[PDB]
Each structure stands twice: as C-alpha cells, then as structure tokens.
Design a binder for this molecule. Structure first.
Ligand code: HEC
Ligand code: HEC
Ligand code: HEC
Ligand code: HEC
Length: 90
C-alpha cells in the first residue's frame, strides 16, 4: 500500500499540493491544486457532479489517510446507504 498523498509527492513533491510543502489552514490552496490537474467536479462522473459548488475534493478524498485505490464512501454525509456504485450505475 501507498497513501495517495505519497503517490502524488513522487511526481512534484509535497509542493504539488501545498505552498512550500506546508498545509494551509483553509484547504482552498490545495483544492485549487487538485483542480489544476484534474479539472472541475462539474466535468466528472455522477458521483462528482452533484458536489460541484458544495464540496472540495478533500471532503471525500482524505489523501493522507487513504491508499491509492481506496474509494471514499458516503455514509458520513448521506443516511440512505448510497454508494458510489449505486449512483454510478443508477
Ligand atoms: C495533494 C495530492 C497532496 C500532496 C502531494 C500532499 N498533501 Fe498534505 N494534504 C493535502 C490536503 C488536501 C490536505 C488537507 C487540507 C489542507 O489544508 O491541507 C493535506 C493535509 C496535510 C497536513 C495536515 C494539515 C493539518 O492537520 O493542519 C499536513 C501536515 C500535510 N498535508 C503534509 C504534507 C507533506 C509533508 C507532504 C509531502 C510528503 C504532503 N502533505 C503531500 C494534500 C496533499
Ligand atoms: C497534478 C500535479 C496533480 C495534482 C496537484 C493532484 N493530482 Fe491527483 N493525480 C494526478 C495524476 C497524474 C494522477 C495519476 C493518474 C490516475 O488517474 O491515477 C493522479 C491520481 C489521482 C487519484 C487516483 C485516480 C485513480 O487512478 O483511480 C485521485 C483520487 C486523485 N489523484 C485525487 C487528487 C486530489 C483529491 C488532489 C488534491 C488533494 C490531487 N489529486 C492533486 C495529478 C494531480
Ligand atoms: C465525494 C463526494 C467525492 C468528492 C467530493 C470527490 N471525489 Fe473523486 N472519487 C470519489 C469516489 C467515490 C471515487 C470512486 C468512484 C468513481 O466515481 O470513480 C472517486 C474517484 C476519483 C478519481 C478516479 C476516477 C476514475 O475514473 O477512475 C479521481 C481522479 C478523482 N476521484 C479525483 C477527484 C478530485 C480531483 C476531486 C475534486 C475536484 C474529487 N475527486 C472529488 C469521491 C469523491
Ligand atoms: C459530505 C462531506 C458528503 C459526502 C461524503 C458525500 N456527499 Fe453527496 N452530497 C453532499 C452535499 C453537500 C450535497 C448537496 C445536496 C445535499 O444532499 O444536501 C450532496 C449531493 C449528492 C447527490 C445529489 C442528490 C442528492 O442527494 O441531493 C448525490 C447523488 C450524492 N451527493 C452522492 C454521493 C455519493 C455517491 C457519495 C459517496 C461516494 C457522496 N455523495 C458523499 C455531501 C456529501
């Protein structure tokens, strides 16, 4: 296993996401960095799209905590048992 943060740091350092390699308080800088490479939520799949304007990437992708390949789940914010699968293949 590799954390997602470590995977990215191999290709650009901690500074790929963080000013001077140091986290911001707000997370806005980091969100802007994610979007600079990956684009906007509105241009992503059905899991991503309805979160445009209400979440930042880090609200689901806890890049230091989560392995490469590990999918965020949904129960922290929704109470119906939805999954990425139940929405992608709605
Ligand atoms: C983007 C893919 C990242 C890479 C590369 C690294 N980090 Fe990160 N880290 C990222 C986010 C989105 C966040 C949360 C939001 C924010 O404001 O940063 C974090 C958080 C941290 C923190 C914790 C901050 C806090 O608790 O106050 C630290 C200390 C941190 N990140 C350090 C760090 C280092 C040393 C990295 C290189 C090895 C590194 N991060 C890479 C996203 C990303
Ligand atoms: C450009 C310098 C990037 C920044 C900044 C961030 N990401 Fe990234 N990410 C980038 C590449 C080139 C790749 C590899 C291709 C791939 O899609 O694997 C990635 C990968 C991810 C992944 C994994 C996707 C997968 O293969 O299943 C995720 C989930 C991801 N990146 C998320 C993400 C977030 C939340 C960021 C900000 C905290 C972020 N990336 C920054 C390039 C770049
Ligand atoms: C929770 C509502 C999420 C937010 C906000 C973001 N992502 Fe996400 N991402 C999430 C899941 C559950 C998954 C796996 C299922 C899927 O829809 O593919 C992903 C996956 C990605 C990937 C890989 C996509 C692929 O085609 O394999 C990437 C690169 C990714 N996510 C990046 C990403 C970025 C950069 C975000 C902010 C703009 C972002 N995600 C938000 C869940 C959630
Ligand atoms: C909190 C940090 C969230 C997580 C984790 C996930 N979602 Fe979410 N979602 C969130 C907000 C703030 C909103 C805006 C509307 C609302 O519920 O208040 C959404 C919206 C959706 C939607 C649109 C339909 C609806 O329920 O309103 C979908 C289809 C959706 N979210 C799916 C989804 C999935 C599949 C998640 C797990 C991968 C997920 N969300 C996580 C906040 C948050």
């Amino acid at each position: 296993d590799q954390k997602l943060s470590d995977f990215h740091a191999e290709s650009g350092g901690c500074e790929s996401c963080h000013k001077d390699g140091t986290p911001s308080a707000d997370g806005a800088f980091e969100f802007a960095q994610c979007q600079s490479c990956h684009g906007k939520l509105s241009e992503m799949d059905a899991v991503h799209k309805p979160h445009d304007g209400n979440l930042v990437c880090a609200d689901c992708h806890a890049v230091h905590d989560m392995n490469v390949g590990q999918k965020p789940t949904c129960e922290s914010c929704h109470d119906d048992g939805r999954t990425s699968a139940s929405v992608l293949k709605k």
